[PDB]
Design a protein around this ligand. Sequence first.
Ligand code: CDL
Ligand code: CDL
Ligand code: CDL
Ligand code: CDL
Ligand code: CDL
Ligand code: UQ8
Ligand code: PEE
Lengths: 145, 185, 65, 136, 209, 99, 50, 99, 221, 50, 95, 47
Amino acid sequence: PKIVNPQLWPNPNKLRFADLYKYQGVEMKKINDSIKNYKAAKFYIGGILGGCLVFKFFIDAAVDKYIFGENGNGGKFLEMQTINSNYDYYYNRQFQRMRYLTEDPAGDDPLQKTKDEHLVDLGFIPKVFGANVEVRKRAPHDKYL
Amino acid sequence: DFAELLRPLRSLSFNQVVDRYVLIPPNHTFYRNWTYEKFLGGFGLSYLILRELPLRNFYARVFVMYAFAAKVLDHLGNPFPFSGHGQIVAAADRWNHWDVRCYDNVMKALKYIRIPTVQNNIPEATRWYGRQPGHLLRADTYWIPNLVSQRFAKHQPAHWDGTQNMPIFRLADPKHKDSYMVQFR
Amino acid sequence: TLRAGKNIEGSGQVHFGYHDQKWGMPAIPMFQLMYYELPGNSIVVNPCRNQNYRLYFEMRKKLGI
Amino acid sequence: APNPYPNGIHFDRVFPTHYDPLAETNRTKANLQLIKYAPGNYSTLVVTSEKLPRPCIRTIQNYRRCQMVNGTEKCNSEAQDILAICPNWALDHMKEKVRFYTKALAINNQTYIRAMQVEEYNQGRTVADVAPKTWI
Amino acid sequence: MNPIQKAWLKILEPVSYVINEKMAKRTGIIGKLGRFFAIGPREYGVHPINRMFIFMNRKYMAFQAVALHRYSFVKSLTHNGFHMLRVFRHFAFVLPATVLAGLGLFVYWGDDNKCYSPDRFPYLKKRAGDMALPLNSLNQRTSAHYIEINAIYGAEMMKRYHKVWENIIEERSKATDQEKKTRYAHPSYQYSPLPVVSIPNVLNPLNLQ
Amino acid sequence: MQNTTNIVHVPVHMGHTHYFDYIDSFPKLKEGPTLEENHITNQKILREQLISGQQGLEQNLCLRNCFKLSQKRYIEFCLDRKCGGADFQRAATILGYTK
Amino acid sequence: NSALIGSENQSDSMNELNTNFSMTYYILTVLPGKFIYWIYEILHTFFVVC
Amino acid sequence: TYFYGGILEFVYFDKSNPDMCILVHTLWIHLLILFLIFTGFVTILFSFYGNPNTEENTIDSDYLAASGTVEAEKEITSIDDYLGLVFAIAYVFGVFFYV
Amino acid sequence: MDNYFTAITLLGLRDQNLPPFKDARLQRYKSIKKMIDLIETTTKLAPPMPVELFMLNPTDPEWDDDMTYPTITHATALYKSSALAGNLFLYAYNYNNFTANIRLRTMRYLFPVVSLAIFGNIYWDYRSQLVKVNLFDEYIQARAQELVKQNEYLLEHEDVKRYVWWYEDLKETLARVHRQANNHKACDFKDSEIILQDFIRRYTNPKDNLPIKFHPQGQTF
Amino acid sequence: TSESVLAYDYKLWYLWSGVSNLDESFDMFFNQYWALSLSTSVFQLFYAVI
Amino acid sequence: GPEQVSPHYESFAMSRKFLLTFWGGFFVLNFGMATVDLNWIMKSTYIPWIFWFQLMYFYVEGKNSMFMPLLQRFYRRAAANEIFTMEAFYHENIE
Amino acid sequence: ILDYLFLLDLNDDLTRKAVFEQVIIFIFIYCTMNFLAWSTVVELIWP
Ligand SMILES: CCCCCCCCCCCCCCCCCC(=O)OC[C@H](COP(=O)([O-])OCC(O)COP(=O)([O-])OC[C@@H](COC(=O)CCCCCCCCCCCCCCCCC)OC(=O)CCCCCCCCCCCCCCCCC)OC(=O)CCCCCCCCCCCCCCCCC
Ligand SMILES: CCCCCCCCCCCCCCCCCC(=O)OC[C@H](COP(=O)([O-])OCC(O)COP(=O)([O-])OC[C@@H](COC(=O)CCCCCCCCCCCCCCCCC)OC(=O)CCCCCCCCCCCCCCCCC)OC(=O)CCCCCCCCCCCCCCCCC
Ligand SMILES: CCCCCCCCCCCCCCCCCC(=O)OC[C@H](COP(=O)([O-])OCC(O)COP(=O)([O-])OC[C@@H](COC(=O)CCCCCCCCCCCCCCCCC)OC(=O)CCCCCCCCCCCCCCCCC)OC(=O)CCCCCCCCCCCCCCCCC
Ligand SMILES: CCCCCCCCCCCCCCCCCC(=O)OC[C@H](COP(=O)([O-])OCC(O)COP(=O)([O-])OC[C@@H](COC(=O)CCCCCCCCCCCCCCCCC)OC(=O)CCCCCCCCCCCCCCCCC)OC(=O)CCCCCCCCCCCCCCCCC
Ligand SMILES: CCCCCCCCCCCCCCCCCC(=O)OC[C@H](COP(=O)([O-])OCC(O)COP(=O)([O-])OC[C@@H](COC(=O)CCCCCCCCCCCCCCCCC)OC(=O)CCCCCCCCCCCCCCCCC)OC(=O)CCCCCCCCCCCCCCCCC
Ligand SMILES: COC1=C(OC)C(=O)C(C/C=C(\C)CC/C=C(\C)CC/C=C(\C)CC/C=C(\C)CC/C=C(\C)CC/C=C(\C)CC/C=C(/C)CCC=C(C)C)=C(C)C1=O
Ligand SMILES: CCCCCCCC/C=C/CCCCCCCC(=O)OC[C@H](COP(=O)(O)OCCN)OC(=O)CCCCCCC/C=C/CCCCCCCC
């Protein structure tokens, strides 16, 4: 396309100064060489995309085989394996029971709880209980850990 | 106008309203985030076109790119990398966080701003739930003993015993005998 | 921690008081062979979650699907 | 996004700014050396509750079920399972709920007494003395 | 120069006439503005990113040719072609296999591309607004079955309550004021009539169905 | 108080290793049957339940679903309405809730 | 924090929704306006003190 | 709450719900940034396109590579074979020199 | 400042304007003090209804599965597809070398094998995720309809009718409440106290030690 | 933890403004029953209690 | 790109030493204001700083006045300096 | 259709080995290292 020239200065003569006009051409020449590679690669890229289209139908049947199995009850998707020995497994279960029985000291802030002085003035005189010194904390079944 | 907001409801019965607007059949296959990918991704596509402006003066295009960067920084915020996050205000719908509604700690982190008390501590219930160890994969190539030893380990089928907490891997705890080399900081 | 309800005076992890500090791993091969940082991508959902799909396969056969 | 509801809580950095949320229409942005505003630009005050552990819930359901079927006198073992399996923080939460609802019960009943108190201008008046008038 | 720059020139042809022909050759502020925004071929219009790719592509490709152009391990087993004693023949396919694995360098980048990310811990931190969570957050979860099944169950039971609700309101409309105040009343309550007032019986205050 | 302070109710044993701190063992930790031995054990229980424990199951499931209600008066309504008019104490003995 | 590299001041408006009611294209309209007033403040000061 | 809940606590309910947008083009930009960093690593330390006699970076790398390949005259085996093993071995003992 | 709309309505701000002087205005604020205690008490007399009506019991052992949400990582599949397309461009850009230079024969021969294996992984994950989402959607719909037909009978209990009759009694009572005077005194709702006290006396026993008794399904807030 | 980090990220904000009729955060009940209680009716006080 | 030829009479750095000093300290303060835990980074860097400097002192600097010179890198500079000189006289030698 | 195609799975790789996700990291590093080393040797025959 034509480029509008403000004509603020005269351009150098092309015959006297030829090097000043060459860069634009060699730049588009590089792109033309790249397009020759893009066009020549149509069958190679298309053959791969065609293979993916055929591979798509085998992957569909393999996923349903992987998930549903032979008789629709579940395939290898339901399988899970491990490298833990029998001791490693029962160590982890006891580690779960230990963390269940791992508490922090002091509990919560008592000042954020209902005061006994407030209950008296509200009409309910609270009864003082003793500490339950006979109960032993234990871990629940493994299904709850 | 308050009666105009209820126009699509006056022609329907209650059963039709519930089936129309409440009991939308579940379909979690849509790419809902394509709206954001198209919008924010347009900045990159616009740059591909804008980087070819025939403005002869280099410093003229410096002004154009600066103006275009001003449009992006209204969302991105911090121009430096690894510094912050962009800010986009999105619409509130029933499908916000739809795939993480199961997790409780995600809800507490998003919704609740707890008030610290005089006894300045995390609530004891929260600390107790946090000590129940998470599951950490046994596969590890970062420790050179496991990188060698696990090449001779035999993966045995872990038969399901009816629970959801089978510790078939190691536990994400600094005191676990298989995780002590991991730095929990 | 602040959002969880614990106000924080000061900053950092160089505890001035009676607490254990955990400096960064010394960037020397001795400590780099004994330790490695916790990879968050290794904390996973327990695979027993996949056993809930057994309910789907049984419901499909009950409904004649 | 709307202007956050006016909040006087702020934290100074270099000098006391005497921040007044009612002095300006739009809240000025927080500069690092000037001020930090309170958390929750868009937040309200609610009441929440922690969820007791699942094994602790199961022991409570076992006690209540065994209570309505066999009576309280034959539920000591189920009561001991609650004290043993439920973590101590859960038992402290269970103990505090009873004390709160005891307080709320006395407050609701004091409102009852003030409401049901017959004033001096309503002595001897019953529903027969009410005029046949509605809100309009 | 590239075709995208030529496409800009066709569209900016009227703009090029206003700036270059008219504004550029004037004087004053209008002249300075036109000469500054003159339209044409770009000064310093080279794209370094495009040039960065061409360089790294050519440099990495020359490495592929060296690593892939190896003497066969299989052909050296018979001691009949070009190789009698090759004590490191078992290393011949390590460089080619390494280069072929580089094809998935960008396909598998980061953690999310090597696994199902929603089953990993970092996905939870992203959905919480890039916020730190306890390491066992993936375990303390309510059943997704409950959340979705209860949402459907509640709305389905609301439609059946609406039908029962209509039959109760209609049946209570035909009830005497004595009956609607003594039924479901406390046993200690003695009924005393109120003056008869006119109060409409509106099902839905908003004109809904 | 030290931020890393825990109170544990069961005995633990710490490792006497340099540069590391962890629980290496639990005192008197007995290993039960393996995951495979437990699986075979459960298959035998599930097999007998599949072959010989499916008759009259619909009635017992209704009694179980009724007893998961909040109030007793709703349980009695569930038993009378859905379970063919069963008795509260009689169904509680079937399910094994009676002492 | 929008001008800091790797800010750790997470409680200083970093994790908040911060919108404004000024002109958009901030670094093009509002921020240059603050620098235009800054140049005036120092040019007026130089003229007065000198 | 009374039977299966904890204490009623007052918290501030954040109405703003943040969520990191899982996008595609953000990783493209991230790769472009790491590509600039890796190219700068190659541009400074692995660029041998200039004066090979004045740039000490190519003087060191050229003469060092030539001193290694000339050791093929020691008659160990095909240098084309074990040259890749030298590079891997250089990262075992090169830990001493922080390579 | 709770019971805002009730207090504003009792003051008459819905139909008129307050007196412009602080004396009569501040007396009018204190005049609704008795009525607020009455209306607060009425709202705490609602009879209970089955909680298993519009909400499944979350403590049911059925929900111990702790099932997660199966999702499709659209962004991951789209990125890896573009990275695979980037490899196809890298081959096309360098077609002449990969095709004619024999030193790159192994890339020419095994590029499609790696590309198919890469596509195989991208589509496998997408296809498997799609199957799991469809299995999840069809189960929650089928299971929900089974639980509806199982608990439909609970709507036939009389507690539902007792609950609605109480609500309609409150509506008719609050409609009869009216302002009687404008003396800015508590006696401006003189007849309304008798109406609301008769409502409270209708569902409670005033001559008890605790007229409002606590039950786990009661009204506190 | 230490995982993959991106150089630039965007954070969405599903703001519950309650003043936008474009999304599901618009409380239709509060506005309809508040506007209903503004008009003079016999149930004007009952709507305030609801 | 090609050699970035400057048309000025002084270099850019020497003409803006005051201004570059401002932005240099601005980004130092920027990092310092952003890094709340800079003392933790300093202490975590102490061991590797001591270790790598005491381990590599001899091979970098100590060799120049102690047991062995290790002149391998110098030999390559001297060979290049002679090749540079030969290229400088390529015209005379070939003529 | 065959079970050999199950090797394309990465959603449930944590159920079997979870080793693929870490080994390829070394392979990508190993290719980067050999790229820097081999290109230096072959290119630097030109001086
Ligand atoms: C045949 C001969 C010619 C005859 C025809 C001649 C007439 C042609 C015109 C009609 C045909 C046009 C075809 C498309 C139909 C569009 C219709 C329409 O209504 O669009 C209005 C359209 C959108 O209006 P909008 O709602 O305001 O959105 C823009 C906002 O900025 C948005 O801001 P935002 O913040 O709200 O959102 C950010 C935004 C991202 O937005 C941005 O970031 C851009 C910001 C601009 C830079 C900032 C500086 C702004 C400076 C202000 C002053 C600008 C003045 C510019 C005036 C330009 C006049 C057009 O991201 C997105 O929202 C999504 C973006 C992703 C969209 C997907 C891309 C699909 C595009 C089509 C693809 C196929 C076309 C071919 C490929 C392209 C050509 C190579 O207006 C524009 O045109 C915007 C300018 C875009 C640049 C146009 C360049 C492409 C022109 C192609 C011409 C043909 C190719 C060359 C052929 C040569 C041989 C013949
Ligand atoms: C139905 C469809 C239509 C059917 C009909 C049409 C199709 C007909 C055929 C079409 C063409 C087929 C192409 C092959 C036939 C070509 C005939 C020929 O003359 O070619 C000569 C041809 C000429 O040489 P060249 O052109 O100069 O260069 C060739 C290559 O560029 C590179 O050449 P290279 O020699 O340098 O490559 C060497 C490389 C070649 O790559 C391989 O073959 C991979 C080999 C890995 C397996 C090694 C197994 C070791 C022994 C295991 C024993 C038990 C096995 C149990 C297996 C159970 C599996 C779970 O092998 C190695 O690297 C050997 C060293 C391995 C490292 C050390 C491992 C051993 C020590 C560790 C022991 C650990 C255990 C110790 C204790 C044991 C307990 C006592 O050389 C070839 O062999 C060409 C093969 C190249 C691959 C072609 C692939 C094409 C794509 C097709 C799909 C894949 C098919 C193959 C899959 C194999 C399974 C992985
Ligand atoms: C701070 C800013 C941040 C903003 C973010 C964005 C940053 C900028 C990014 C810029 C880099 C990307 C450039 C994109 C286009 C921009 C326009 C442009 O190229 O510059 C003007 C460019 C001129 O360049 P120049 O700088 O002025 O001078 C060039 C020199 O003289 C010498 O000439 P030359 O030809 O030798 O120079 C080549 C030149 C430009 O060469 C080009 O032609 C650009 C081609 C780029 C295509 C990239 C892959 C896309 C594959 C096609 C997908 C199409 C899907 C369509 C679906 C529906 C249809 C079935 O450089 C490049 O090749 C740039 C490529 C960058 C590397 C990309 C490699 C990715 C592999 C790593 C994976 C990473 C994952 C992300 C992958 C994302 C993929 C979406 O204009 C042209 O080249 C005109 C080309 C006209 C013929 C091409 C017709 C289309 C053929 C497409 C290739 C087909 C391949 C096989 C299909 C594969 C899929 C099935
Ligand atoms: C939102 C608010 C925030 C944003 C606000 C905006 C702020 C933007 C800031 C940007 C400021 C404007 C940018 C102008 C250009 C950059 C400034 C500059 O000095 O360049 C002129 C200067 C040369 O200017 P010249 O006078 O025209 O050159 C004449 C001769 O040809 C030169 O060579 P000669 O030997 O023939 O002549 C003597 C030569 C003697 O000086 C030298 O030649 C330096 C020798 C070092 C080269 C030895 C090899 C080491 C470098 C190898 C490559 C590493 C990078 C690639 C590898 C990794 C790939 C990622 O020059 C001198 O007399 C003294 C030079 C200046 C004083 C020392 C400079 C120290 C600070 C600058 C370097 C920063 C390094 C990174 C630290 C920052 C953390 C990332 O450029 C350089 O020396 C290299 C710097 C290249 C730019 C990279 C840094 C950009 C940002 C710098 C900002 C200011 C420093 C901030 C940190 C200060 C820490 C103490
Ligand atoms: C065979 C080699 C030696 C093997 C012995 C074991 C290894 C040596 C350990 C102790 C080191 C002290 C000796 C300095 C050696 C410096 C050589 C050197 O670094 O190369 C410089 C050299 C060029 O640099 P240069 O500056 O010209 O070298 C001259 C020196 O600067 C200095 O100029 P120069 O002319 O004086 O050097 C001549 C060389 C002469 O060496 C010989 O001719 C060897 C002697 C004859 C053979 C004796 C060994 C017999 C072995 C068979 C018996 C074994 C039995 C085992 C059991 C039987 C098994 C079946 O050195 C000596 O003169 C040794 C005399 C020591 C003076 C002792 C005075 C009393 C000192 C008391 C205080 C000691 C404090 C020490 C503190 C702790 C140590 C740091 O580079 C090369 O030659 C490259 C090729 C490598 C040559 C072959 C490998 C030899 C080891 C080189 C180190 C690794 C290079 C390869 C990796 C490069 C990076 C990728
Ligand atoms: C095959 O053999 C091999 C080579 O060949 C020898 C190699 O060179 C190499 C080395 C690889 C390289 C040198 C490449 C390095 C590249 C890296 C590290 C990352 C590159 C990243 C970028 C260039 C950033 C690009 C940025 C973006 C894509 C985001 C902004 C762009 C947007 C939003 C456009 C939206 C995209 C589309 C619509 C897709 C459609 C595609 C198009 C081309 C349409 C373009 C449309 C227009 C209007 C221009 C390897 C590894 C190899 O294996
Ligand atoms: C992007 C790379 C292109 C080339 C790919 C080559 C490699 C081939 C290997 C691909 C393997 C396929 C794996 C599966 C990918 C799954 C794709 C996916 O998840 O997104 C699809 C998803 C479907 O949307 P839903 O209906 O919501 O979901 C329903 C699901 N059943 O698609 C989308 O969301 C649309 C966005 C996809 C990309 C769009 C590309 C846009 C480019 C614009 C240029 C076109 C010109 C536009 C001009 C406009 C004129 C008006």
